[PDB]
């Protein structure tokens, strides 16, 4: 349902339902949309079984959390927006239509989110999606898709509104990079996948990768920034992008965080023997280790033979491979730094120019400037969890699109809509 | 001044003013661009000659007006704006941030009008630009480069806010497009261009071709459409990509409107034999004819023997090549339509798919919206010449970048940039 | 629950509960603002019959649709906005805060929806709200005043969020208006309560009274605009302020439009014999007659011994007291117009300098552009049910405090705060 | 020129230019509202000059930069704005409308800063208004109304959009607050002049008292907060509402503060029996001593027989009547407190309840969130003088009407304007 043979015929089904959607009423793309959101949350618990299941990755109370956060806080209609000028020279709109017929290739992290958030999304403006899911996270992203056409079915259609492939391909995902009736891709991955997407000879809205540094400085709660920090970077076993990923600590506070980490927040400190022989595990001569990444700490643990415990930690210089390498594990390296300075660069080498996402803990306004400035993300928390980005303890709207690489940020239905200007010449000025 | 030998010098001195420009404050970015917009006027009559000179097309009062629209209307630091959400989890902000350093392709056609306008508004982002001009018009492109530096060495600097190349080429054009500190190209061009610069694995901001129609409907002021579409059909001998190129005229009306258009507009109707050696003159084997391209009617009259008059007028099928073809010439045919469905059949086929602008005359708001709906275009036109779309008679902004294959629409300052939220968790909410 | 016996006491009460209210997140807010959107669908049917039995005014149908229109269309805590600039020199907020307690005269027209959608929005801003409703209608409106406080409760409280006396009266009205602990009064009612308010000393938002022409013009589709019409005026009986309470109609189309009216809208033509009995009943020496305000046009007919109709309509001059005073019943006067020109001078003179709602319909932009910039109303509404106004059919939210006098328009959350700049300075722009 | 001899006259004449203004184009506005910003600089030497005689308050050099803020950064036309929503049900457009006349009470403090500030606002909302000057500043705010109309007259008129009288009176001001063409008046004074005006029976937009306290905790930058805070104390001689009129000091820095402020800004400490003797000059059975209000340090010592110094400063209980009175005088006593809830608490009872101005220095953002909630001002500063609220070293821009009593904040454009909603049903929503 939603889910096809070959690509080109999930694009055509998908471009049968736009010409429906493109004049439906934003009330009657609403009724589809609140559709969605029910069934998510109704299902949220299945599709979190699923994606841990199928993909080995994560674990599913967090991710039941994330779909119910896609359900409650994905912008729907009241994200496309009009703006007016108007006077003696009349009245000017700029509206925001639609692409078309969107492709959509999305992670096996955060699959089915990605895949419900990105709909959600496109649907508001006047669009139909296709997706070509990650391959280790197929029954997932199709169960997804299905739920959503399902949705669609019970508010009235149209069918197609969402579309899949049965058996995604690198093939397949070309099939639809070099489909002329596909005006725009939103890529939610890594440099391979969103790289050929911009070499497409479309628009592709791009995530890229990141390594999120959370500082921390003299000034923070430190009690509160160890469990902030904690909660926000085990959460689905660290798979978000967003995710914290490395710590950078005022000399100063450093042991008390550390010690707040292991005392109250099940933190297990590893020796730099231990260091040595996770990092052969977790780091390959074929890159990071598929098996070991979105696992928890106490399975990572185990596997090099080592028997409550959330998070690995130790305390390292930034190059160590476990602190500048983007794990997706929840496995936590604290660089120490001499001055708030030495920290911002610590933090921002640390971020390797990805230009994703940074935090920070401080109470300091101007050391807050500082940093924000210097480290230029399309992220930035301040004295939250990661998660506080997408909504979860932080004002403002989920995405599982950021779209660091070409610059749209926190995706969302105005997003994925093509701007209008419309000029009533000398008339429809009431004033 | 702002000039270089090669493409890698032109991108390290913009990339070292980027890193000035970035700091700058928006008073400072203000007085440099209003001292751009100064100098655009002031040395609005030499950019104008320069490009009839160079190119051998448009003309020069109306490439005087075209860069004076560009001083007063193309949006300043104004353009870059916050937005703040707040409550009890805090305030998140979203900012608009830099890019750095942005390439830009522009064409012969608004040569220096593009320059300046990007220029502007890539300036009041935080960013520098640098270009590699079209090669019929380097002499005029390179000159406006040199205005703007002249502009900010006048406000204190920096110079090398805008830089470009003193031989542009294909190869020029490909070191800008794979250069990696680039991570945005603005394509002012044609398909070629914007096709590659969309293979890049860059972002690109994408300009697309035209063939705009122009619809009237038996409710129009027919008098002032007559007097409407011929002043924007010739405006710059028909170079703007948002320019009339062909008419839909309603049967009842399309002789009175052609009648004023002969009377009182300075049309010169062609016989179907003047058509014919026309069109073996401006269509080749080689595609358009340049030695045609932006020349007034006069002289294309006199090129094929035929001696007040500004613009060449007929009666013809749609398919006719001097009506499907986007000629950028003052050559108009008119298309007459049964019926107001017909009319919309007709315009929409004329508009190729392209998205970019069409234009109707009409005073019944119900015809209006069919119109805009079926026809989704980025600039739409109602009861007023097209250059109307760009603030010349019509409320909103002048730019010279309309991204039509990449949905921006009409750029300006903020369309070049990358967006940012800041999560500052749990404080700064006065409420 | 939330009503008490005196003025003071009510008003004490709400400013316990708004220490409370101020300090709440938006979601708590909108936890509360669901249920009372619940509550409210929930017993639209109760709140309907009650004032139709209370003050024999109006219809239970279309009071429940109402109740419906406040429950969905009303704005909550969304309503709320920041407003931020950012530069080298800092960061500048602008946030809407609350007044704190709210006074409200309501009417005994639209009373409980007065009410709940007063409440709604001054809650979302962090206020509470004390009413003195309508003598008429005094049951009903605390009953609407006490499933507000059960939908509170419901959710956690506090209670008192809305208060009110048990027998209001004009002195009770005069210890609100004169209590220092109320900084601002909603007055939705009569000129006699408006300017009482507005002599109070306090800020004043001031509904005023209407008399809404509608003009037809020979543009219009005839058809629609009779049923559009005659469904806006008999809605609630002409309770509505917004409500058409004569036409204005271009001679060509006149015959067509009443004989619709006639033929298909349920509307009766009464002889001048007919319309003098009527004025004489409708009309008395104390002013309307109280006895007829918000009857339907059967019963009206019967009070004169004239035995399907819904609405009384016949042609005459503007300056007939049917047509030129606003009656809040379902009669209406058709007033036959030259031109246009003529039309709007008449609709002009019939709206009384009021300010407050006029409707055309017309197909013309050029003349809906005359129309509107002559008559200058808070509300005009262009070829719909004037009930389109207020987001039945229309887009746009709903309200019942429609400040025609003070001039803040269509009343909702963001009306009641208190305007709140802070400036941080040399911090927080993180650009 | 625009200075009639009785009230009724200016008001009549103000209603003909208004019918001339409301049919003005926003570029004509502008165009005059252009003239009035270069001609306020041109003459705000003669302005600031004219205040100081008359009134014999406050100083030239400061009343030349309070014109120069006001010409640069009082909004113009681009603060009348437009809001849109569309869909399938149509487009509803709400829209900024004139009031008409406004009738204006000015202070003779910043007498032709407000008149110069609330006619560029008002008239780019299609207003005229009246003016009825403070009677002790009235030839200076004749000569600021003069000047309009001659600023007027360059751009081709019309004469009259501001207005006044020759012999202000409270009489003058009674006939303006009943006269039935007013139906707005702008208020900006004492609580005298404002309660009248909201007793009118119009609407009042109402300035209120302030007693503005600056809060400096531990974390400040003591040496800059000295210098921020006499500098915003002694600008124009503590004559704005907005100015520290008292310090709150935590205990810990409090003499480092103090010392700062007499070593490097220029105070002189007095003693008690000094405080005693300028308690009883500065305050009398009249009440504030009319002259002294406005007098520089120098002088206030002078008039007591003490003789670089620009301001006068102690340490004192919140209840002394030099700290607890608003003085709108270079006096400025130091309050220590022991935590930084003692500070707050300090504060607020030293803010009077006027929400009118408060201001902190402080690094700490949850200090900062604690204070801004608890103050609850329509202005709030952060490490910076006052005057950075109304655009001096602060984001945003300037007025001299802030609307702390009725809510509106800091008054532009938009504040003068009546809301109008136009509902277009069902056409000319093109997405
Ligand atoms: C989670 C992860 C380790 C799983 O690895 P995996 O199972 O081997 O799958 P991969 O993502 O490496 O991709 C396998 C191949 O299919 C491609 N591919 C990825 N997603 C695809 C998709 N929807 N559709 C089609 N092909 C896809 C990849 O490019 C790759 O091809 P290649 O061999 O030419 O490089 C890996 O996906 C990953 O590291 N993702 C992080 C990217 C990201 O978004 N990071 C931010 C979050 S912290
Ligand atoms: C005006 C015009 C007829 C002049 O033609 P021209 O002098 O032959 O120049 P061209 O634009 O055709 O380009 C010549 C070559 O340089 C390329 N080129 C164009 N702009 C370039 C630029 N800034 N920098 C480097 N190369 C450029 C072209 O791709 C082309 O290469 P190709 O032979 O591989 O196709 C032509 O530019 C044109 O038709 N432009 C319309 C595109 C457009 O924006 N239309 C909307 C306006 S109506
Ligand atoms: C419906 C209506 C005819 C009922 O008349 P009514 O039962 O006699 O009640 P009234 O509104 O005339 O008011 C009776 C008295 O109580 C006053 N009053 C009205 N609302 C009051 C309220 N909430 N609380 C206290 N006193 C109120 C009135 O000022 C009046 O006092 P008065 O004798 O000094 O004038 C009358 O309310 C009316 O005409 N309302 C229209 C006002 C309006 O909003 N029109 C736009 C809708 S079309
Ligand atoms: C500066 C000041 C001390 C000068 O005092 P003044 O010369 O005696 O003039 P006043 O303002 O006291 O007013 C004198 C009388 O004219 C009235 N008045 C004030 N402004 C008026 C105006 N434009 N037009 C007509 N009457 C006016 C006053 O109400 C007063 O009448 P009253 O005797 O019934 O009370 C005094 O105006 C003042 O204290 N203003 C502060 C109000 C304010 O805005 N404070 C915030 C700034 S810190």
């Not at 299945?46 to 779909?67: D, F, P, S, Y």
């Not at 939103?186 to 791009?206: N, W």
């Not at 001499?338 to 940074?358: I, P, T, Y």
Request: some cysteine; hydrophobic content about 40%; proline content about 4%.
């Amino acid at each position: 349902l939603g889910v096809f043979d070959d690509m080109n015929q999930a694009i055509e089904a998908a471009k049968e339902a736009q010409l429906v959607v493109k004049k439906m009423s934003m009330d009657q793309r609403e009724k589809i949309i609140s559709a969605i959101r029910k069934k998510t949350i109704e299902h949220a618990e299945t599709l979190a079984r699923m994606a841990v299941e199928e993909t080995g990755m994560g674990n599913v109370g967090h991710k039941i959390l994330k779909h119910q956060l896609v359900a409650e806080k994905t912008p729907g209609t009241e994200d496309i927006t009009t703006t007016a000028w108007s006077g003696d020279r009349g009245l000017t709109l700029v509206e925001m239509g639609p692409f078309g017929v969107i492709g959509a290739i999305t992670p096996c992290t955060n699959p089915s989110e990605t895949i419900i958030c990105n709909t959600i999304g496109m649907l508001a403006g006047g669009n139909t999606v296709v997706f070509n899911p990650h391959p280790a996270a197929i029954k997932t992203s199709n169960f997804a898709v299905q739920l959503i056409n399902e949705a669609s079915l019970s508010a009235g259609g149209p069918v197609n509104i969402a579309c899949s492939v049965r058996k995604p391909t690198l093939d397949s995902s070309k099939i639809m990079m070099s489909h002329q009736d596909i005006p725009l891709i939103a890529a939610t991955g890594g440099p391979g996948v969103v790289t050929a997407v911009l070499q497409s000879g479309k628009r592709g809205i791009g995530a890229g990768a990141g390594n999120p540094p959370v500082l921390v400085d003299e000034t923070a709660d430190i009690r509160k920034a160890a469990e902030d920090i904690i909660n926000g970077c085990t959460f689905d076993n660290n798979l978000p992008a967003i995710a914290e990923k490395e710590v950078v600590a005022i000399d100063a506070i450093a042991n008390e965080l550390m010690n707040y980490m292991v005392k109250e927040q099940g933190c297990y400190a590893i020796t730099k023997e231990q260091q040595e022989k996770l990092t052969n595990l977790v780091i390959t001569p074929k890159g990071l280790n598929r098996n070991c990444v979105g696992k928890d700490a106490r399975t990572l643990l185990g596997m090099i033979g080592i028997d409550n415990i959330r998070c690995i930690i130790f305390e390292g210089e930034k190059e160590h491979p476990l602190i500048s390498e983007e794990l997706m594990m929840p496995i936590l390296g604290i660089v120490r730094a001499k001055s708030f300075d030495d920290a911002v660069e610590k933090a921002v080498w640390l971020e390797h120019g990805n230009r994703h996402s940074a935090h920070i803990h401080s109470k300091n306004v101007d050391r807050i400037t500082t940093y924000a400035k210097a480290i230029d993300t399309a992220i930035l928390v301040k004295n939250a969890p990661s998660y506080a980005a997408i909504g979860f303890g932080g004002e403002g709207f989920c995405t599982f699109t950021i779209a660091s690489r070409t610059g749209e940020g926190l995706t969302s239905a105005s997003t994925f809509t093509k701007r209008r200007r419309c000029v009533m010449s000398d008339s429809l000025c009431i004033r």
